Write a protein that binds this ligand. Structure first.
Ligand SMILES: CC(=O)NCCCCNCCCN
Ligand SMILES: CC(=O)NCCCCNCCCN
Ligand SMILES: [K+]
Ligand SMILES: [K+]
Ligand code: NA
Ligand code: NA
Ligand SMILES: [Zn+2]
Ligand SMILES: [Zn+2]
Lengths: 341, 341
């Protein structure tokens, strides 16, 4: 399968992440794409192409225009405000707060943010557009008739909502891909999120959209980021009722339990009538991933890919989470190998 | 007037504060109480006394018990979780999020927090309880017949809402004092927040209570912390409709303009029929304050104190903001001087 990848992902290289009460090197670092690209390549997927340039038309159908405008100039305004560190939100619109949007950069960053563990830095906006472009190019391949394609997106996007960034995400690549397929002729598209963390961002974008189905398997929000979304009870709202399916699971979950959730999610996706599935692939469910508590092994990733591919509909894999361990590449390569059959 | 003060305020000595994308020494540090206490004694207010022992009965009538329970063991759990730095929230329940409460320490801290700039540290809970004791003791002085008294609270409390901490606040001292006065036999009490920042926590606590009136003068939330509450349109709700009065003002506001808002706010308080007024005094409105944009001069605090005492009802002054310059003590003392007459 073709691999879409942009070298400009490296433009995203913030030096700080708020974690455990300290500012440390980001977990979502550039080396991630390097090892993944290397592993999938030696796995046989070496047909790598750079993404083409794309306007904001597609992304403007899933993200708030004010949010996008904010991101594009955030760093400039933050630096111009006299701040020494990187752009990190401190005040947030939580319970019982006014819905008004602030004017100052310090207020707007909080308004447009769901998590302070993600800082905006020079290049974030340009890197984010390159990652979005990889997703759009992968979608076009599927629309062109390709059975499978892999967009090595970075930074990831599943935690980015309609009008908020966080979880190392700014532009929801999987959401753009999905919208792009609809724009190309599809009437129903599904997004399957196997990243360890819930795709709060993606859920938000399609919560009231009936033409898109969202299924996510993730660590139980009651005890894993993002914490405030991902509960089984959330199934959609209004025009999008019944199009959201969450499968929260607890610590130590083995593939034997995870796989069952996967099987059920694919059953709901089949019933929905998805013409294609955008897969938000996160290999952070690995038993050896530092910030996660699932116990899947490398071989399970081959099963995962094979199973999703058995849906019989075209597949677009979009890269998301997966950290630390040098096996992130192997695990991503295994999913693709599983899809190839 | 008598001065209620506690040495256990020192137990709150956080080492980090997320400001400008960096972890720097907290603006709200112990030296603040030292400078203020010395200045009030200097001005003749040397009758300082330590607060008596008080239970949680009063505070339980204004704060959520789940929230209070959370604060008492937040630092312990945080450390047991293996985190190096101090307890700082990263994930927050923002727009379109679930109302569910997480079970993990990392999730609960975000759930019970409105601003990431405030960190929980060893001794914060005990420090917060002493500051609340001083407020209660001050309240009883007013209930006993005193025309005025000063509760030198630290940490501050006006940013602490019903079930959330932030803005250097954990327990709403002014709210507890107001509640205490009502428990002593009062039917209608008012809180006047002159601190530079909006009293978002105080507003939240009494938003739906008709027995308490809340008036606040503060930097326009569109460009001043907390950024998500403090607009003139917020006048109350349900059982407490019409009991909230916000006066947001722009950058560089001098006493010439600020004075008019004070006058109107006192007029509404009188029309409400307040039997006593708790005054949340923050001197961060000073032209030299490092994090505020108002332009009050030190003499203006004398005029302010006098104008408020001219209300003709008992006054309980509760310390809040005021940072950087040592003049904070002079400004606070000038208010007590204006009030004393
Ligand atoms: C795209 C993505 O997978 N992002 C991960 C979200 C960051 C989780 N925050 C770290 C806190 C752990 N204690
Ligand atoms: C009780 C009180 O006075 N709290 C003040 C809270 C300060 C907000 N953080 C500073 C934001 C400017 N960058
Ligand atoms: K997921
Ligand atoms: K105020
Ligand atoms: Na939907
Ligand atoms: Na009220
Ligand atoms: Zn993840
Ligand atoms: Zn203040």
């Amino acid at each position: 399968m073709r691999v879409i990848f942009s070298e400009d992902h490296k433009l995203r290289n913030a030096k700080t992440e708020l974690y455990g009460g300290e500012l440390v090197p980001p977990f979502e670092a550039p080396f991630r794409a390097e090892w993944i690209l290397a592993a999938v390549k030696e796995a046989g997927f070496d047909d790598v192409v750079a993404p083409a340039r794309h306007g904001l038309e597609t992304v403007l159908k899933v993200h708030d225009a004010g949010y996008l405008n904010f991101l594009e100039t955030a760093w400039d305004r933050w630096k111009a405000a006299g701040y020494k560190g990187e752009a990190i939100a401190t005040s947030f619109p939580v319970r019982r707060t006014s819905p008004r949007i602030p004017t100052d950069i310090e207020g707007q960053i909080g308004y447009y943010c769901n998590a302070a563990e993600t800082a905006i830095s020079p290049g974030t906006w340009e890197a984010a557009l390159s990652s979005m472009a990889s997703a759009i190019d992968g979608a076009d391949l599927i629309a062109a008739g390709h059975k499978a394609a892999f967009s090595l997106c970075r930074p990831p996007g599943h935690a980015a909502g309609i009008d908020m960034f966080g979880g190392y995400c700014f532009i929801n690549n999987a959401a753009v891909a999905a919208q792009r397929l609809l724009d190309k002729g599809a009437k129903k598209i599904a997004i399957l999120d196997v990243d360890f963390h819930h795709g709060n961002g993606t859920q938000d974008i399609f919560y009231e959209r009936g033409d898109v189905f969202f299924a996510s398997l993730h660590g139980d929000p009651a005890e894993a980021f993002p914490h405030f979304l991902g509960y089984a009870e959330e199934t959609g709202k209004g025009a999008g009722a019944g199009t959201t399916a969450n499968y929260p699971m607890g610590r130590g979950t083995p593939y034997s339990v995870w796989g069952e959730a996967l099987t059920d999610s694919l059953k709901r996706i089949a019933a929905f009538g998805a013409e294609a599935i955008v897969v938000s692939l996160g290999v952070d469910t690995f038993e050896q991933d530092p910030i996660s508590f699932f116990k899947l092994t490398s071989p399970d990733y081959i099963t995962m890919g094979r199973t999703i591919a058995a849906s019989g509909v075209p597949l677009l894999v979009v890269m998301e989470g997966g950290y630390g361990v040098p096996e992130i590449g192997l695990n991503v390569a295994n999913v693709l190998k599983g899809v190839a059959g």
